């Protein structure tokens, strides 16, 4: 038994709390159920580290069994890592594709053992046939990067993938084209959209979760104003449930032109460079409350409403 892969076994016991510790070990389904009730879960947490390391010794766990526990820990806890999206393109002259899971698991294994000599590859098959892939990057000498993994989410038929941000950016063209060859595609396009919720990023892209339908003394004088500022938000956003996106970086290189000032930047031909980031949770139903508040105009700009439509948040704006 190697010590450095046994350090990762006692690390993931320390990274789970005790309320959901019975959720992970029943879905890990490698230990029998008589040994789970033998280990007392109501004791001190360092005794849970000592009791589970005797169970991993006598059952002879491996580097794929310890990485099987890392997928189930990151399935119920999807909040710690961000998810960038990849867009694969279908080539010309193609009508149907040939996909097989036994043809996918060997072609992705041989494409990573050929390029680098220490790549740990572990697979797990989930509901509606989604493959969950861990890649541990080793460079030329060491046993690979166990503390900082890299996750690829692939739903076995889509050309869209959900890959997490690795801390080694030099292997990111290597990870992208290795998914392209094994899934029978010819072009990989890194699409610029990222968030911390994986369940909301599959709702805004796949668009299957967004729509679920089948006294006269307090009188206002603003009859033409009151239902005008909410009729734009009902025909675009509505009261329907929306996916969550918390970040949008707006790179502006626009100019300044207005009819109020005639001496403020009236001779400038140089562009005014800017970058505008939004850092607030649930932004798609946060901007809909500004229009009945009266602090925003009822002709709302289309840059804030094309965010579930045009399927990115990084925008580049040109204006005179």
């Amino acid at each position: 038994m190697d010590e450095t892969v046994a350090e990762f076994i006692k690390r993931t016991i320390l990274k789970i709390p005790m309320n959901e510790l019975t959720t992970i070990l029943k879905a890990w389904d490698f230990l029998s159920e008589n040994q789970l009730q033998t280990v007392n879960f109501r004791q001190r947490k360092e005794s849970v580290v000592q009791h589970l390391i005797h169970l991993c010794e006598e059952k002879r766990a491996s580097i794929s069994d310890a990485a099987l526990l890392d997928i189930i820990y990151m399935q119920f806890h999807q909040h710690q890592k961000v998810w960038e999206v990849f867009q694969m393109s279908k080539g010309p002259g193609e009508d149907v594709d040939l996909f097989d899971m036994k043809q996918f698991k060997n072609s992705f294994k041989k494409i990573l053992q050929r390029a680098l000599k220490n790549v740990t590859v572990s697979f797990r098959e989930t509901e509606e046939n989604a493959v969950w892939i861990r890649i541990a990057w080793g460079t030329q000498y060491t046993k690979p990067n166990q503390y900082k993994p890299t996750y690829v989410v692939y739903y076995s038929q889509t050309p869209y993938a959900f890959t997490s941000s690795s801390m080694l950016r030099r292997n990111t063209p290597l990870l992208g084209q290795a998914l392209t060859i094994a899934s029978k595609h010819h072009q990989i396009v890194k699409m610029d959209l990222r968030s911390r919720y994986l369940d909301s990023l599959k709702a805004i892209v796949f668009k299957q979760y967004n729509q679920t339908f089948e006294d006269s003394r307090i009188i206002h004088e603003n009859i033409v104003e009151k239902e005008r500022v909410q009729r734009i938000t009902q025909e675009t956003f509505g009261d329907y449930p929306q996916p969550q996106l918390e970040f949008a970086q707006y790179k502006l290189e626009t100019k300044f032109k207005s009819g109020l000032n005639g001496s403020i930047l009236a001779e400038r031909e140089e562009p005014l460079r800017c970058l505008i980031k939004f850092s607030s949770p649930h932004l798609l139903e946060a901007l809909k409350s500004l229009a009945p508040a009266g602090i925003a105009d009822a002709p709302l700009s289309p840059l804030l409403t094309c965010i579930p439509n045009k399927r990115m948040n990084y925008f580049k704006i040109r204006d005179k």
Partner: peptide
């Protein structure tokens, strides 16, 4: 307002 075009997006390049």
């Amino acid at each position: 307002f075009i997006i390049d």
